[PDB]
Amino acid sequence: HSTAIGRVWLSVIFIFRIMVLVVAAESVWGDEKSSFICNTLQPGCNSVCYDQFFPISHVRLWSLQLILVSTPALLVAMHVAHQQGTLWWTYVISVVFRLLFEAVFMYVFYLLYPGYAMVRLVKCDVYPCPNTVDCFVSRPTEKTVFTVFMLAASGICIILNVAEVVYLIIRAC
Amino acid sequence: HSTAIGRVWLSVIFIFRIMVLVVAAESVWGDEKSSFICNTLQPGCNSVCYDQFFPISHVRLWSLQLILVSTPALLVAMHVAHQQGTLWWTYVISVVFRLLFEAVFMYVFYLLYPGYAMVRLVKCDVYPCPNTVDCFVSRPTEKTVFTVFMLAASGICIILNVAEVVYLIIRAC
Amino acid sequence: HSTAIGRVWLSVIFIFRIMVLVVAAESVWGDEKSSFICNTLQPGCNSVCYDQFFPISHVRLWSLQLILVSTPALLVAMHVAHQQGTLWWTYVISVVFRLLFEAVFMYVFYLLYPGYAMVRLVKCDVYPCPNTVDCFVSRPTEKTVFTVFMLAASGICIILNVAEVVYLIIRAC
Amino acid sequence: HSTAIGRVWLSVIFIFRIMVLVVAAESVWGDEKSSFICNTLQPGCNSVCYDQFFPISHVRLWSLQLILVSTPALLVAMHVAHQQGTLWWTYVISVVFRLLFEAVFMYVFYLLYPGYAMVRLVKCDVYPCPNTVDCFVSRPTEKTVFTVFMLAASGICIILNVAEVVYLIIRAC
Amino acid sequence: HSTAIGRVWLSVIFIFRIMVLVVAAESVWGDEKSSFICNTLQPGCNSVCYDQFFPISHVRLWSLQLILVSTPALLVAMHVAHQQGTLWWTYVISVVFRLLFEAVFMYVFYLLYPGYAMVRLVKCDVYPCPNTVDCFVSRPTEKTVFTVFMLAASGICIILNVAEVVYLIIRAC
Amino acid sequence: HSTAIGRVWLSVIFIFRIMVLVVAAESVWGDEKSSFICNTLQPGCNSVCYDQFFPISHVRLWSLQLILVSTPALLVAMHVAHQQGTLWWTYVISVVFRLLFEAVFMYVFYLLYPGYAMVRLVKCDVYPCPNTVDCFVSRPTEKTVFTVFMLAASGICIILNVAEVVYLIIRAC
């Protein structure tokens, strides 16, 4: 029932995000916290500083995004298999929710990590760490590269979803 | 035999909980105890303080909940395959037990963790740790985010199960 | 050839034990010995004290129990597939051996771990540890919770197997 | 083409050895060398003492044994599938080689580990460790229990293979 | 629709790259950063020096390359399955993009790692490491061997893709 | 199209090498470098000495050998499936290349590791390690046993491949 821009391109880009996330989950972000060390001798400051600068990691943000993005698609597949009416409205609503999930997660990424580029050193000033301590991020450049790849793919998904809605509206009218 | 509110929505939400739990099991809670350190030099206080504040972890609580929730569904599938009567009563009983398991595990979550928000620092006062020691939770914010997601999905399951019972009762009458 | 009490309930409970054991194997008991530390500075006392108090871990005891319990079931399936007589006697013998394996492993659990509740601190007095040393068990409460779940499921299996034998005897007579 | 004593019992026991070995490979013998510590401060003596007392571990000895035992069975299956004559001689030869592999590996186990019972402490006197040092085996009792299970299953395989040869000879004559 | 030089040789070489990358991902590059130590006592200099000399690791560069190389192939397969016109132009465009991805990633490898040979010692001069510190690469020779294998396979892919384009053009004309 | 000596024996031996390599990859060679320690206090000498004495590990040498050995077999399978002429010449060429790969990798094993027997202690004299330092190999005897098994299987493959060529030549003439 889908048009060519979402049947082929959107599915392939989604598979691309799946494969990239799987590669970068255990490998790039495997030692995100274990190798996250701070210049201070205060016990327990590695954990609090890591949590302060990484409230939720990129992989798990992308993992949650991919699950949320695929949820309307899973709903349609579950709904179609059980019904088998006007399923066109159901599909366009699912695409709209998919677009909203992409936009929301991209905006969440902007809020959580202002500036899509990891930095080697982060200035951590939180209890119990005295004054400001220097904590070092594991693989900042590698994480930045995969962040650019995932964000670019997400932006492509946003554009493709918008084109999907426009194409379906034009098809209806 | 199920209605639309449980055939599609409840199944999709259950799959959502499965995928989120799988993502958050090895990744978020992988280093829950290894990186759980306390400010004291007393040997063995990391283990006792972790056990005191985490009698059972969220992932394993959710893992047990998902197994328990799916158990009445597994019973019906096993019963139907072997019988192949009035299976409607069997299904509604399974839904009621599924609702009870969701409510019980949510209440257990309330008892074990009063306040659905991890804190960076926990005040541990237990033998052999002298007086009160400061122990630090690994990824408190990330665990809090996944706790909110899982609890929200569980609440949706509770609402959907209640709607399932009401819809079936209305269908019968 | 089986009756309803073992065809459905016993199989589901067995699957429940499988899923719970898989969840609790790598997660709960993954760091049973690595995080098992003692208050003494004597080298090698962590290993000997862990072995003294845990001659065989609960997961491996349950893993061996599940393999042993499923062995008569595997024998019948292997025997039936190769024969395809009076297979009723073969089935009831397999159920009896399954019941005996459940009872033996439960009794073994009683002998190895008198008192089905882990304790945070264990008093270890064994060579080369001088006098008595304080060793700390990893996740004592979480292991206790899963021990209760597994033992309760095993007790249900014992009751269901006894009911299976009684039902088959009543059916024959 | 096989008789009942090897078609059912031998196959089930082989599956039992497979399942037990898989359970005991990553779990029991996972930390065989990492947690193998010696009482000396001499660097590198943990490795040489572990190698001296464990030239080849039980799991890998059993893993090699299971591969070798299944090799004549794999040869027959490969030979039959490609031929599809007097395959009875081929089968009995495979059983004889299977029996020889079981006996050889059991004898190898006797030579490598005289006395089928792990000991907590081993007296290591090898370069560069000065004089005799005390090294501690990880999970000696748990490894002993699984050693007894595997050796008992191997002995059952030896008896079943001998019965297989005798039954086939009686069938021929 | 493909000719023999790409249907057989290109596919086999791609499978060769997949298998080699899988073997060398967890094994060779598993401890790339954990065992990457520097001669300095400055905290956090292992991470910054590793990132400076390895902005993105070879395995993840190859993993991204393989995903990108297979993307036009995945697009054609997705497009063909949904269409089922002049698909010859679509295929040759996919081959051209595949060739460009191979060339771009090979050039990226040249830029990121000038000189396709790992060195045991790297001179790291970056904040906060004082002056120049000596950092040691894990398995430099083994990584060099797999780098040569992967680059040689990539060069073969480039040559085969060029031959694919030439053969198709000759076939058309 | 293959004769009996390569259809059955060569395939079974190849499967034997696959299973042995899989068993010995994560288990025997899992801690090859992590537990490779040297008697010196010079930082970074564990890595350089390990690389000096193990330019490429046995498992990865065998993994590359198995991929290379199976490559001509994969080429024939890919070629046959796409053609479906004189495929006999193609098969014998593949066998010859398979024999050459076996011989080349065995000779490479001789060059990289002169003497097919691991030694507990290796005399490392390389920068920055001062003079000659004593480094200890992890599981030298266990690695030696698996080296003998793999080399013996490789020698059997060489003999079987030579017999395959001779048998095919005799069949043609």
Numbering used by the authors:
A (entry chain A), B (entry chain B), C (entry chain C), D (entry chain D), E (entry chain F), F (entry chain E): 16 to 99, 129 to 217
The study reports:
Connexins are transmembrane proteins which assemble into hexameric hemichannels (HCs) at the cell surface allowing the exchange of small solutes (ions and molecules of molecular weight below ~1.5 kDa) between the cell cytoplasm and the extracellular environment. Two HCs at the surface of the neighboring cells can dock in a head-to-head fashion, forming gap junction channels (GJCs). The GJCs connect the cytoplasms of neighboring cells and ensure their electrochemical and metabolic coupling in a process called gap junction intercellular communication (GJIC).
Addition of MFQ to Cx32 GJC did not alter the overall conformation of the channel, with an RMSD of 0.447 Å between the Cx32-apo and the Cx32-MFQ. However, an additional density element was clearly present in the pore region corresponding to the previously described lipid-1 site. Upon addition of MFQ, the only change in Cx32 GJC density occurs at site M. This density is large enough to accommodate the quinoline part of the molecule. However, there is no clearly defined density which fits the piperazine moiety of either (+)-(11R, 12S) or (-)-(11S, 12R) enantiomer of MFQ, both of which were present in the sample. The site M is formed by I33, L36, V37, A40, E41, S79, and I82 of one subunit, and M34 and V38 of the neighbouring subunit, and is thus largely hydrophobic. Likewise, MFQ binding to site M decreases the pore diameter only slightly, concomitant with the changes in the electrostatic potential of the pore.
